[PDB]
Amino acid sequence: SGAIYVGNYRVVNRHLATHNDWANLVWEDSSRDLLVSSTTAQGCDTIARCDCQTGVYYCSSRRKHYPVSFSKPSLIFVEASEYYPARYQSHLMLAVGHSEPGDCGGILRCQHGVVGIVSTGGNGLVGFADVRDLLWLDE
Numbered sequence: 001s002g003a004i005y006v007g008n009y010r011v012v013n014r015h016l017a018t019h020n021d022w023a024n025l026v027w028e029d030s031s032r033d034l035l036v037s038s039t040t041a042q043g044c045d046t047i048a049r050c051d052c053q054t055g056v057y058y059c060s061s062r063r064k065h066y067p068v069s070f071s072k073p074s075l076i077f078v079e080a081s082e083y084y085p086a087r088y089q090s091h092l093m094l095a096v097g098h099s100e101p102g103d104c105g106g107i108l109r110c111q112h113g114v115v116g117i118v119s120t121g122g123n124g125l126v127g128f129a130d131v132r133d134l135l136w137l138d139e
């Protein structure tokens with residue numbers, strides 16, 4: 001679990017969005033596993049606007065942060081889960097690191113701000129849904 005709070009927006013994994021997120025929907029994209037909802041309170045976070053390929057993510061299944069080198073956002077095949085059929089997930093960044101399904105929502109950050117959130121993983125892999133291209137989150 002986890003979310004990004006920026007301005008009057010809340011960014012969550014689309015597969016973990018609540019009834020309240022859907023009732024306050026701003027934008028969602030199944031191919032990216034993202035959903036953005038509106039909030040009444042002003043948010044705690046800053047979005048990175050950069051091309052960093054290193055950063056640090058929070059891993060809830062270890063209660064720890066880990067440094068990572070990750071790929072640029074791209075279209076990657078993701079196997080079927082209980083939430084989606086087998087498909088290509090877009091705007092996904094992969095890195096070597098520990099992750100389990102419940103780690104989804106953990107933030108990846110660089111020196112410039114929030115880069116994305118945990119969305120996928122495998123045997124020693126962790127995948128992050130990028131949010132740096134969503135310029136409208138800042139206004």
Ligand SMILES: NC(=O)[C@H]1CCC(=O)N(Cc2ccc3[nH]ccc3c2)C1
Nearest residue numbers: 033081083099100101119120121122
């Ligand atoms: N973005 C997606 O399509 C998600 C939907 C929710 C989901 O359970 N998965 C599978 C998954 C996620 C993180 C994982 N970390 C290590 C194994 C593992 C497996 C894929």
Ligand SMILES: [Zn+2]
Nearest residue numbers: 050052110112
């Ligand atoms: Zn950066």
